[model samples]
Target: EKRLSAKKGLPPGTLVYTGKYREDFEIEVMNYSIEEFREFKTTDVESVLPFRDSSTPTWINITGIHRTDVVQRVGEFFGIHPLVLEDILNVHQRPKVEFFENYVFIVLKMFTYDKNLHELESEQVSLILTKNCVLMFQEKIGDVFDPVRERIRYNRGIIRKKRADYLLYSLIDALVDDYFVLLEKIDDEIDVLEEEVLERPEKETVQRTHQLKRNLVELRKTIWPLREVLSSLYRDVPPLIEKETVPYFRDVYDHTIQIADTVETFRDIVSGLLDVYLSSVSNKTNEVMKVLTIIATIFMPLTFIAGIYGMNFEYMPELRWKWGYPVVLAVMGVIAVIMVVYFKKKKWL
Candidate 1:
């Protein structure tokens, strides 16, 4: 068993996988026959080597494939394709399935809540299902698959009675369930944004809407292909999947469609929120401009009167009269009051 983590900002193919490696990469080996069931966890990969050749079905669960050397070694040991190795190294690859000469490779995204950050995070999971065994690889070590482990350990449901194909479907179904939890969180966030937009559309609210929209865009990039991948599994009878398990794949396909519909709905809501924010800001600007224009309009006549009196004309009639100054002042005051009253009546004040 190997435990590894990835480093950030490395070149595209420069693999320096190092992170919080678990003490021992816990591998759960569940071997089942028609009349017998055996399950055990091991830190030594070689311990289950003999079962690989056994007639019974075997499931090899490998967590934390952050070690490039370990992954390379496993690729060599299992005769995994170079392209599959590359896909495994590129953790951000879109969810897809590839059928090879001897096995089927599937890449899936699993969502989980990060307690430390209080946000959703995605993990990449790769599965290689062959004739007798299913190999799983994860980016990090965690207890997310504990339910699946328990199901196998307890021999609950039809998991122990089914073949490796059924087990593969179970693992894929569990991963999809994690996505449902994430979608729920996204729905809550969108609902909050809707309320905020109605009450007070702040710049931060707009920014958040845009950010979430971008996240959904990226999520769609991953999910749309996933929908197709799952649908293909349901529609096309791949050798790696048993005929009895096609219905399970169809259920997953339906779930994928629902997720896609939800993503589209969220995208529309975010777009509408952005429009509302822009219109609100524009209305605020228009109101300010209206007030300023009205004030300037009211002062125009007063300024003209003052300009005429201040002129040094040789025989200006108003300038020669002592009472003329008071009269002009009274007239300006009247005009100002009238304009104010008019604006107030029009509700533009």
Candidate 2:
């Protein structure tokens, strides 16, 4: 979670790096057309100025947005608004899209799940789509854009032949696809929890279930707004989003809807797992209590008979008789056997 007081009373357009990433700032520029392609990395913000109006479409990806000065320079040179830059720097901003006169600004949450750690990590990705170039800003070094990059480099699909708007679509599509991947892993986790809850629920199981549930809730908060962003991209008819790309945006919207649905379902299942855990635990305790009650019940009459024999009185007839000890022992043994047999007959043993 981000601390809100860092920029509590600052001006609306002010830029503050609210995220925790302190990695080195790096910019990767990829200029590509249908016929040829070229890409390189540079730390200088000035190096990206040439591709702003290049004939081929350019993708300028700047990693580690925690550096406010670098982001400010890129925004100032690229003619991006300070408010948009502010949105990019604020990692807690909801997924949204805004149409500018010369570019389209999009901000969304990107998620990566670490299987080894059993954790879900999220970063904010902001994309500014212009006539001939796309600017992407990330909070950290890694992203889900690798597949899109592969398609662009290898010409695996129609990505090379499309415009920057189409490139925008491809990146958004990649994000939605990654959500599906994340949900699949979460589904596996839910399945494992379901089995564990049914068989032998424990305290650790409850904690894991709660953690997964919290993750799903966070996922929903980030992803639900993306549906509106995609819908706005296609429905509002932004000048930057071309007509051909409308269908593509709609496709991504559909995928977002599906992911939202899956997350909701997972939330319900996790809650059900909690209920099952509670009942299973209670059932185990009930079993133990039943066994304890049965033991106490069988011992009741034996304790009473021993109390009667140990009473100190002058008229204690059985204590004075020679055969009294053997008879009393046989009678107590008979009573114990009869009580056990009765319990078994009643199916309470």
Candidate 3:
């Protein structure tokens, strides 16, 4: 019923955008140091080639990755490895980091939850942090990096004073924070479902629990590997990231641990929910069976009496008695009452 996207026939390290295509595949470049900041937007990819020699670290954010040959040209301009370029365009990647000679390549899954759609969405984010610049390729344009932009724009945070490595830290930090938010929303739904399963189980509740469990599974598939990726980043210590910036990554590493633990806890809760649902259904069915048994038990002796009276026998004594009808009904009533009292004493009624 569920599977990953089916596509093949392409060789490894081939630059192909596996996401949506759009007309507005432009470049937004921000050049800043401790003193000054400048922002520019352009569709021409060659305009960013000059920022390679700047004293300050330049950050070039591509709004879209669906444009053809952009990855090839940028790989050529920045001396990025071909395989890293292919990873940038391939959006179905797990969170990972690789170190080439001149640059560090990192891929992350950026997530969002649409309340209106009641679903989760993700996109691939590739960061190429070189000595003088931080190049980012996004699947599409959105506000995951807006806080970093605001901090840089208004010089509110230490980001403007730091280099591109610190800027990269800020960007990654923002995305991970959103993961916490998404988890909170999922937990709220889970809490509601927990109540439904316990107090009032219905078919709708079963369907909802399945959907929420699927979401948790999807989340685990992302965050579990991400925790390892963060640890790898901290231990290896790429040269592109400054020695002072290592602590920021360590801080992010701790955050990943908490997120991983939270994902595991959610998965356990999902399993518990399925158990609760099954147990509830079984109990409900058992209660129904008990009721049916009680009904049959109440009528069993009455059915036997009726059977004896219904027989066409030649030696029937009460068949002609004037009070026989009333007497049989009274006996049936007394038997029913006695059976009900017996059931009450047994605590089965």
Model 2, 238-339: lDDT tens digits are 575455887878878888898888888888878787888889888898788868866777677778887888888778887568898788788878887876
Tell me each candidate's TM-score.
0.77, 0.91, 0.91
> RMSD of candidate 3 to the true fold?
2.5
**Number of clashing residue pairs in every model?**
2, 0, 0
Stretches of candidate 1 exceeding 4 Å from the true structure: 1-26, 32-39, 112-121, 240-243, 299-334, 337-349
Residue-level lDDT tens digits of model 3 in 1-349: 3435544887776777777545567789999988888999999888888888787989889878887588788888887777788777777778898877788888889887776345778888888888778988886678588888889999997898878888888888988888889888887887878998888777777777778888878888999999888888788765744566888989999998999999899889889878888998988998898799779998987999999888888898886688998899899999898888877564545
Error of 2 at 223 (Å): 1.2
Error of 3 at 72 (Å): 1.0
Give the C-alpha miss distance for residue 22 in model 3, angstroms.
4.2
Q: What's the C-alpha lDDT at position 52 in model 2?
A: 86
Better of 1 and 2 by TM-score: 2
Better of 2 and 3 by lDDT: 2
Runs of candidate 2 exceeding 4 Å displacement? 1-5, 116-118, 240-243, 319-349
lDDT of 2: 0.83
Q: In candidate 2, how many Å is residue 308 off?
A: 1.7
lDDT of residue 77 for candidate 3: 84
Candidate 1 structure quality by residue, lDDT tens digits, 32-52: 876777888776766756666
